[PDB]
DNA sequence: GTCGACTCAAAAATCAAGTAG
DNA sequence: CTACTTGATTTTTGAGTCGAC
DNA sequence: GTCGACTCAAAAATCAAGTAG
DNA sequence: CTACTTGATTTTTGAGTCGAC
C-alpha cells in the first residue's frame, strides 16, 4: 500500500472483485475471474490479500467508510440533531439508488461472511450513538438509551432502502418526501 | 397444492414440518428432497406431488409463518385502547414472538437469497394489512399523517429483533423497554 | 476406490431390511457419496446383488475348500465340510441373507449357485462310491440331500436363531452323516 | 364372509391370485390383475383383503393345511417310522407337482412375507419333533436332537422339491426313487 | 473429452495470443475445465507446445505425401497453410522456444524440394543453379507471401496477384 | 540525454543489451545482467528507458536505420533497376555476416514485440513499392503487383538470411553468388 | 476424473537519497 | 336394515435420468 | 469422478354411490 | 539549479502445488 502504483494496483482488484461479487456471487466468482477484470497477474491478489474471504471484508469496510463519510458532509452544518437527520435520511436513499446494484453484495455477505455482516450495522451504530448522545444532553432530542435509537433510525433507513430504493425504481414522491420529514421531527422533542 | 383427502393433507404436513426443522437447522443447500422426505417418513417422489419444485417449498414455509405472525399479532391488538396503545405492545409482542421463532429465523436469511420474491411479499403483504389498519386510524383522528407509515414501524421491529433479540440474545432491560414506549407515543401524538 | 467400497458397504442395508426395502438413497446416504454415483459404478439397482454374489462366491468355495483339500474318507470329508460350512455361514451371515434375496429379484444366480455347487459335490460322490467309501445311489440325488440338509440347517440354526449348533447337536449330526453314507 | 355370497368371490379373488402370483410374480401382479382375471370390481379386492400382502397370508394358511392333510393321509396306514417316512418323502413330492402353483408362492414368501415363510417351517417342525421323538422312544429311528433330525429330512424335501420340481418338470426315476429310499432307510436305520 | 476440450481452446490461443502470452488459467476457461484438470493432463506448460509441435509435424508429413509443379504446388501450400493458419503461427513460435524443429522443418523441406528440383535442371525444364539455393528461394517466398497474405492478412491473394505470381515463377525458371 | 557523459551512459547500456540478448535470448536476460555488463547502476537503465521491453524497440530502430544507409551506399548510385537487386541482395547478406547479433535479436523480436517486428517488413516494403512502381512503366521490372513482388524480393533475402547466414557462416560461394544473380536477373526481364 | 483456492522463486519496476557539472 | 359391489379418483412408490461442479 | 434436483411409469389405496339380500 | 547516479526496496509475474470432493 505504499507505493502510489501499489495502492492503484490494490484499487484495481478491489474494484473489480465489487462488480463481479454484485453479478455472479462470491462462490462464483474465481481469483482469475478478478485478477482478469484488473488486468494484473493472477497471485497480486495475494499480495494484497491474505485470502479469498478478505476480499469481502474489504469490500464492506469501504462500503462502510464510503457511505459515513458521503453522509457526514451533508451534516456539517447547524446545531440541531432534527435538522441533520432530515438531510442523513434522504441523502442515504440517493446514495442507496446510486449504489443499487450493489445490495446483493450484502446477501452474498450474511452467507459468506456473517460475522463482518454484523459489524457493518455495529460500527455504524458505533457512530450513531456517541454522535446522538451530543444532542440528547444539549436537550435538543429526546432523553432515552441513545444505543437504542441508533439501531431504530438504521432500522428506517434500512427497511425505506428495501422498499422505495431496491423493490421500486420510481422512489418517493413529493408529497411522501414531506411525509417523511415529520414523522423524524415527531419522534424528538 | 393437492388438498383432497386428510391423509393428503396429513401427509403434505408430513413433508412441510419436517421441512422447516431441516432448513432452519443446516440451511437450504444442505437439505435434499431425501432428507426431507425421510425426516417426512414418506415416498421421495411425494415431495414433488405437493410442491413443483425445492424452490417452492420457501414459498409455503414463509405463508405459514407470516400468517401465523400476522393472527399472533392480531390477538393482542383487538382488544386495545386505540392505535397508540395498538403499536406499543404489536412492536412489544413482536420481540417476545421472535425469541420463540428463533431458531427458525435461519429459513429467513435462506429466503433473501434463493426465493427474494417471497422474502418481498412477506414485507408487501404485512405492510398491505399495515396500511389499512393506519388509514383508518388517522380517520379517527388518533395517529398523524400512510403507506410509508407501515413501512417506518416495520423496520423498527425488523432491526430491533435482529440486535436485542438474535445477535445479543439477552433481550431488552426495563429501561430500555419503557424507552421505546415513548418514542411510539411522540412519532404518533402531534408534539 | 474408496468411493466404490463405501458403496459396497449395500451389504449391512439389503442384509437387514432386503433388496425391496433397500434404496438407492439408502445405499449413497449410509456410504455418505452423492445419488448419482451409484449410477457412476453401476447399471441398475440389481446390477448391485451380481456384485455382492460376485463376492460371495469368492468369499465361499476359497474357504470351504481349504479344510476338505487333504482327509482320507470322504465320509469324514463331508463331516468335516458340513461343520465347515455351518461355521462360515456365521461368519457370513450377511452374505447369505443377501445370497437368499438372489430366488425373488436375479433368480438366475440362485439356480446357477446350487447347479455348480451340484457339479463339485457329484464328481467326488461318484468316484468314491465306486470304491466303495459311500453308499452306491445317484450322485447328483445325494449330492443334492446333502446340499439340502446344509441349506436347512444353516437357515434354522444360523439365521432364523443366531445361536448355532451345541456341541451334542454337532455329534447328532456327525452321526446322521455317517449312518446315512456308511455303506452297510 | 357373512354370506354364502361373500365367500364364493373371496374365492373367485383367492385363486385367480394363486394362478397369476405362480404365473408372472408376486410384484407383477397388479389389484387389477387378481380382480379383472377373477372377473370382478377393482375395490372388492379391499373388501375382503387388507392389502396385496395380506392374501400371500391366506394363500399359504392354505397351502400348509392342505399339504398336512394330504400327508397324514398316506403316513397313517403304516406303524414303523423308517416307512413312513420313506412314504411320506415320496408322496411330498408327488404333491409337490401336482401343486407347483401353490409350493411357487410359497418361494416368493421368503422376500414378500418373511413371517409366514419361517411359520411354516416351524409349524412343520413342531408336529415333525413329538412324532419323531416318540419313535426314538420306541428305538425305531436314531436317537439325536428330534428337532435337529425334523430340519434335516424337511431340508431334504424341500431341496429336492425345487431340483426335481420347479427346476424341471422330471421329477425321480425309478433308479432316483429306489436310491432315495434307501438314503431314508441308511440315515434313521440304527446301526 | 475433457483433455481434447483443452488442445482445442489451447490452439486456438497460442496461435492468436502467443505461447508467454497464454497461461494455463486462460486456456482451462476457454475450455470450460477446472484449472488442476491441465496438469492432471500434461506435466508442464512447455508439454502442451511439444504435443502441439508434435501434432502439426503430422500434418505436414500427410501434405509432402502427393516446371507447372512449382507453379501449382506454390498456390496449393498457401491454400493448405490457409486451412492450417492456427497451426503455422504455432510452428512460426518455435524459432524463439525451440530453434532445432524450426530448423529442421525447412531442411526436410529443402531436402524434398532440392532432388525434384535437379532432375528438372537434367530434362532442360528449369536453369541450371545450385539446387539447395534454388529450393530455399521457393521456400522463402512461400513463407514469406504465407506471413503477408495469409498469416498478418485474412483477405488472400486474388486471381489478379494469383497470375501474377505464376509469372514471376515461370520468368526465373525458364531461360 | 542531455549531457555527452550521460549519452555516454545511454550507450554503455544499449552495446551490452545487444551482447546479452543476442548470446542467451531476451528472457535469459535480466536487467542487472545488463547493468552490471555496462558497469552502471541498476535504476540507471530505466532513467534511460521506459521498461525492458522498449530496449528491444530501439535496437530493432538502430538496425533498420544501419541498414537502409548501408543498402543505399552501395545501390544510391546505379541506373539499372535489375542491378539494383543485384547488389541489394549480395550486400544484406554481407551485412549480416558481419552483424550477426544484430540480426539474432530480430528473430527474438517475433516473440516479444511482434508490433515493430511485423511494422519493419511492412516498412521495407513501402521502400521496394515505391522503387518498383517507377521501374514498371520504365520497361525495366515485369509488369506484376508491386506489393507482391516487395514481399517476394524480401522472402528470398530473409530465408537466404538464415540458412546460409545464421545456421551455416560459411556463407555463399562465388558459384553461389553468381548463380543467384541469375535467378533475380531472370525473374525481371520483361520477356 | 473434476475442481478452484493458494504458493513461490524469480526478476521486473520504483523509490528515497545521494553526487556530478 | 346389513351385506356385498362397483369404477373413477386420489395418493403413493422408488428407480433412473439429467446437467452441474 | 462427484454431486443432487427432478422426471416418470406405473401401482396401491380410497371412497362416493350404488345394488343385492 | 539541472542532470546523472546508486542499490536496497517494493511490486509484478504466472507457472506449478495443494487438498477436496
Redo the contacts with the bound molecule.
Sequence with gaps: ?????????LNKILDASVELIADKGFL?????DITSKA??????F??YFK???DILDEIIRQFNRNMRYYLKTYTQNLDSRIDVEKVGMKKFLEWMNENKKYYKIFIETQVHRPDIYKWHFMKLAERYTTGLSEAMRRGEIINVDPELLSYVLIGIAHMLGKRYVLWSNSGLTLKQQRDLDLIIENMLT
Design positions: 500500500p505504499k507505493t502510489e502504483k501499489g495502492k492503484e494496483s462464483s466468482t474465481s481469483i482469475n488486468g494484473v497477474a493472477y497471485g497480486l495475494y499480495f485470502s479469498k474471504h
